[PDB]
Amino acid sequence: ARIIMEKAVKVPFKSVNELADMWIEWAEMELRNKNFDEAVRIMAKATQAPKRSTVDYFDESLSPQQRVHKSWKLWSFYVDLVESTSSLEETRKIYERIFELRIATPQTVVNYANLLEEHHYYEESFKIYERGLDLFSYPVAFELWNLYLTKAVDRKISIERLRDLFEQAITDCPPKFAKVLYLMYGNLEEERGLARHAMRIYERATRAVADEDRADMFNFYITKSASNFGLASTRPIYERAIATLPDNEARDMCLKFADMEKRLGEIDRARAIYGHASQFCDPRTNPEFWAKWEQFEVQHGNEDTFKEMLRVKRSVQAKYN
Amino acid sequence: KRMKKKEAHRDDTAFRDYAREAEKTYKRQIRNMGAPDLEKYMREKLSAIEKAAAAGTLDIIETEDGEMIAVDKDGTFFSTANATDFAQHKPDKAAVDRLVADLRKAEEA
Amino acid sequence: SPPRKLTAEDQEAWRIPPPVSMWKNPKGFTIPLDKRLAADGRQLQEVQ
Amino acid sequence: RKPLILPAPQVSDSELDEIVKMGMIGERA
Amino acid sequence: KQEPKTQEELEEDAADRDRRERELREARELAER
Amino acid sequence: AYTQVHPEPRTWLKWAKFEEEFGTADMVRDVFQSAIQYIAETLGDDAVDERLFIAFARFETRQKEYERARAIYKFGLDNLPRSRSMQLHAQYTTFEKQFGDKEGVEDVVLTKRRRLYEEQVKENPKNYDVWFDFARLEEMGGDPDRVREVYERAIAQVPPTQEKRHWRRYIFLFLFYAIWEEKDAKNIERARAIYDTCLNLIPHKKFTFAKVWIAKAHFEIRQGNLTAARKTLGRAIGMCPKDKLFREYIAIEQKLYEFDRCRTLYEKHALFNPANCQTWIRWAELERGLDDLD
Amino acid sequence: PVLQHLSLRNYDPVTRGPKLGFEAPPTENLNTLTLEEKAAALEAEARRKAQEEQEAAAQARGLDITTLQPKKPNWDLKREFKQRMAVLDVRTENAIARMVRERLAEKK
Amino acid sequence: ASIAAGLAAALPKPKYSSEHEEPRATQRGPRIVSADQIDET
Incomplete structure (x- = not known):
């Protein structure tokens, strides 16, 4: 059987996966024959190449035996065999050999981090997370960056190192992940530091988020400012939301600011905000805004104010026609 | 690399100058070459080595390591500068037909 | 010398608009009235 | 959007500050 | 029902545990010397 | 010939990538050495580009030569100005965070945080939060001279406006600096001098903060100087009689079992603020605790 | 015996191949809340508030x-001062207790 | 320039010896060289 397996390994088959399956079957037969060390030796001999092997496995010019070092299935089988048979040093050597061939996916980096965490090693898990982040920056490690952030939160690292890691993870991240990253950074700044850093992170997120989540981020920042500080601190930022949000979003922000000013007592500021919203929205297309302005004028506003509101509505109707 | 190359293609669409368009069309034409016929270039390299060794310009030496080295007295083999028979090169029918076909393809475009 | 490197900013900065003549039509073109009054500077006068 | 020059409010940030000082003084009383 | 807040031990990494073991080994070697 | 004709770092990096893909590592080392040597001898020792150092260091890391790359990083961060080394320093920080040790990563993070705090202080000298963050980073680093210099720089940022918020922020920064000097530096005389300077620089004719006086009294109590704390409390009461300061003085007198001093403080608070029924209730409770029903 | 010395973390025992995160992502195996x-619950709590x-x-x-x-001015500074005065308050209390004991010994 | 000499003194010996390092691209035969490599071979 060993001679037949060696002859099949020496047969240049078309598919390298066929040779990998034959090697895995030989290793399984050796393991069933109480030769797990011999199986690991045969697996290492099958995945034997130089320190800088760069032969593409998809290239249909070399033999499948030569293009067998970049086999992910054979490497995974060898790692699984050596995980329950050797110590952590051989597992680290196998991980380094897999990283040398650049055939390790984000799942491989996650498995290496889990193996490091299972061996009472947290700095090595952070090193593996950094390797996963550096090997694939933008798309393929945002989830790995989230896992690294979770590990750092569970490790209770120092504030400077955590801030540096959060800045590195949110440096060139896409906005769909950068919104959650900035929210987590603000939560960490509020939990383990002053609220000024969280406010600055929220302000940066309000200027660096997607247009769909810009209004939600602005509302969350306003709620956080009202919870952690005074409600007047959101007075200018909402004014900034007047200059940044989209037309319906700016109308909603102006309505919220007018409600806040009416609650505080700024009747003139609320009337000016309502007039700006009426100037920034058609009367026939935004009847809810006109109804809210009329309700506010009934709650606060005279007959002259009602006539001015009617004139503004007529002007908006003329502009929309 | 593919995404950054396509981003550079999108950024380079606007007319800057003529050397930039010249480089762009040269890269496009080199891409439209396809893979070069490395086996062919192997044959003319061996044939030119044979005729130059018969002409004494190239020298074949079996060194102490038992490998055939081919040293050049002049520089006429590498680049056909110093080789006054650069005029005597005659392209075959297929290459001239390929050139005329590509020029006519640009015309029809 | 090797040619100066031209950006798109320069190529748009040396764009000459077509002359909207309000005296002459040697080819009898029916120009829009919008283009006829663009070069007229009387529309840029402050009545103070 | 054309820039709307909003007038200065009749109550300022400092005036609102002393207003809420008096308010929390009454609340704590 | 309030969950029992068991005091979890500080997870010493490879660096921290290795430094502690190396400090103990160096102290033993210094005592032997 | 290309690197002779076009001796920019970009062409040297192109040669480095070519010799990486199609040649030995010794050729790549020779290419990088020739690049840095040529740029050092034609643009001078000062104008060598950091990208050559970054690319050679990353080539060393991908060749798993960690001490070589560390030598490249430290030499690039030594012999180049700080104005043209932000990317090289960032690559050092991410390399130490990648495959370095804990002490080196901590030192790199401390250097990056110090640079960011210095930039923030240069941009906003009145930013008390940035100064407090820099002081906390210096305290975590363990440098006493750097922390003292940061505290002196933050104390020199006197607020021009006499607003209550700016004065409160300055008083909080001074109290944090005094607490850092008392805890880590353990300098009682420096803390007393800082408290005296904060009391003198505070415009008590316009706005007074009882928190600074309470912190000074607590620092004097921690030093065992009860007479100095009593004199400071009396001076604070005379300069600006506050209910919080009077309550703190009464609590300090009750902790020292001084019933006569507590009664005198309650009488002074009743004379200054007869409308405050809380002071009268506290005095009645103190009299009831002394078994004096009459 | 073959499926007894494997970690079963990245190799599928049924498909005889590498595990994929499209159907079995590792984030479901975490014992805590990921990013x-x-x-998401913080935004819902803010909306409810x-x-x-x-x-x-x-x-x-x-x-x-x-x-x-709803909060006093410089509340973050007050919280930072309270957190920093962890052993300083204990030292001040110990000094006050020592002074009280010295006064009692002088009286006695 | 002192930067090149200082950094050349700064590096240590590389820990992976590469005296057997054949170049990463096996150039196809024949090896035809210039006139200056006759004494080199």
């Missing part, structure tokens, strides 16, 4: 004093 799990504040403002007729300034 995808986080930043805003709705409760709006309902309280609609129900009430006067402006609450602790609604425009």
